[PDB]
Amino acid sequence: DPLRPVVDASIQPLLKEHRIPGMAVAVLKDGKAHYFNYGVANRESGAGVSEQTLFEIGSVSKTLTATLGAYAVVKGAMQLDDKASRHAPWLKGSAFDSITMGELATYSAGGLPLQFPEEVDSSEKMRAYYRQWAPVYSPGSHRQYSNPSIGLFGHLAASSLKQPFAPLMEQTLLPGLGMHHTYVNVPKQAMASYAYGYSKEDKPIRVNPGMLADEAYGIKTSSADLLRFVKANIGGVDDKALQQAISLTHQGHYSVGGMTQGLGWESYAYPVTEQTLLAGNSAKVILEANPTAAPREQVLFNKTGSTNGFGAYVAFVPARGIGIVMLANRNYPIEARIKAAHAILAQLAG
Numbered sequence: 001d002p003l004r005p006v007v008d009a010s011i012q013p014l015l016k017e018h019r020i021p022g023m024a025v026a027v028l029k030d031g032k033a034h035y036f037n038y039g040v041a042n043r044e045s046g047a048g049v050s051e052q053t054l055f056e057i058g059s060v061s062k063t064l065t066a067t068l069g070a071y072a073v074v075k076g077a078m079q080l081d082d083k084a085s086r087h088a089p090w091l092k093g094s095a096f097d098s099i100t101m102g103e104l105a106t107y108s109a110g111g112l113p114l115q116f117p118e119e120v121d122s123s124e125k126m127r128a129y130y131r132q133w134a135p136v137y138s139p140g141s142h143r144q145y146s147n148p149s150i151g152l153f154g155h156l157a158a159s160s161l162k163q164p165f166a167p168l169m170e171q172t173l174l175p176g177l178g179m180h181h182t183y184v185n186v187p188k189q190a191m192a193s194y195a196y197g198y199s200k201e202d203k204p205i206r207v208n209p210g211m212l213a214d215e216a217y218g219i220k221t222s223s224a225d226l227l228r229f230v231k232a233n234i235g236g237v238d239d240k241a242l243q244q245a246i247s248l249t250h251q252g253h254y255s256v257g258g259m260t261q262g263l264g265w266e267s268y269a270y271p272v273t274e275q276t277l278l279a280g281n282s283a284k285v286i287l288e289a290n291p292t293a294a295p296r297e298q299v300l301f302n303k304t305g306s307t308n309g310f311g312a313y314v315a316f317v318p319a320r321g322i323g324i325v326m327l328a329n330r331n332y333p334i335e336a337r338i339k340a341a342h343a344i345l346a347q348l349a350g
């Protein structure tokens, strides 16, 4: 593959530096998909990684959940300006009577935390949590990355469509995106393709159960399926409704520095410097609260994602028809993901 030398040049050093057991890389250029596979999906057995290997993608799941929400909007089942309680009777009489679906989707509801408190481990406790939650900031004023925030958005989006989230995604949305091997719950026939994640101590692990995990960070997919998603975000899909939904996830709602927050996807003016990309994906933007600013007025879209044993990254530029997917079974530094992707994308762009 003429592109192997280029991809290898940025990926190989990464694998060695962070002792990554395996990584599936997929690139899109001139309409064609290119696959580069490294290492193993299972260290004990030695099973090799392929573009069909299933990896946990963590927060990258939010781009798919966001697409489901956009789909609900297109179908007329809900509007982003809808108060959250309009789609959950159990939220009536809480702070969510004055918070919108869009604010939940863009982490700007007012300070919902990164993760649910450790004690919130059941449906009953989760409902109680939201009903007692007190806003920290006025709605729309600050961005505080939050799983409970986007998780609730996805949960309610599914409810607006009158179907449970998991089956809705697996039986309708994902198939519509051409993603037939993407799961919230990996089925029996696909378990053999499911890689094992590896902690810092090299222990084989997989994602732990959690409230709204399916909506916020529970997707398992392959580099082939995720690149098909990238293609859908560029070349489009056959279904008009789904196409409209995809476009909605490209719209900027507000910005934080050089990063513009949309539904799921986070975008930047293209060409973008490695410095700007690193900043938008820095700990300051990820962990702390930051005031929202007016949205950006070519564009690169991206999203990072991790689980205790996995590290994923996806970035693409529609106007140039290029994109890259990097799925690894080691949660290695986000900065390393950005640097490798930026280098490869630069070569692909010309």
Ligand SMILES: [Zn+2]
Pocket (backbone or CB within 6 Å): 004, 005, 008, 009
């Ligand atoms: Zn090589």
Ligand SMILES: [Zn+2]
Pocket (backbone or CB within 6 Å): 001, 002, 003, 033, 034, 035
């Ligand atoms: Zn090729």
Ligand SMILES: [Zn+2]
Pocket (backbone or CB within 6 Å): 155
């Ligand atoms: Zn529910």
Ligand SMILES: [Zn+2]
Pocket (backbone or CB within 6 Å): 180
């Ligand atoms: Zn199939």
Ligand SMILES: [Zn+2]
Pocket (backbone or CB within 6 Å): 184, 185
């Ligand atoms: Zn499940």
Ligand SMILES: [Zn+2]
Pocket (backbone or CB within 6 Å): 142, 290, 291
């Ligand atoms: Zn402030």
Ligand SMILES: [Zn+2]
Pocket (backbone or CB within 6 Å): 018, 330, 331, 332, 333
């Ligand atoms: Zn590492």
Ligand SMILES: [Zn+2]
Pocket (backbone or CB within 6 Å): 349, 350
């Ligand atoms: Zn050039």
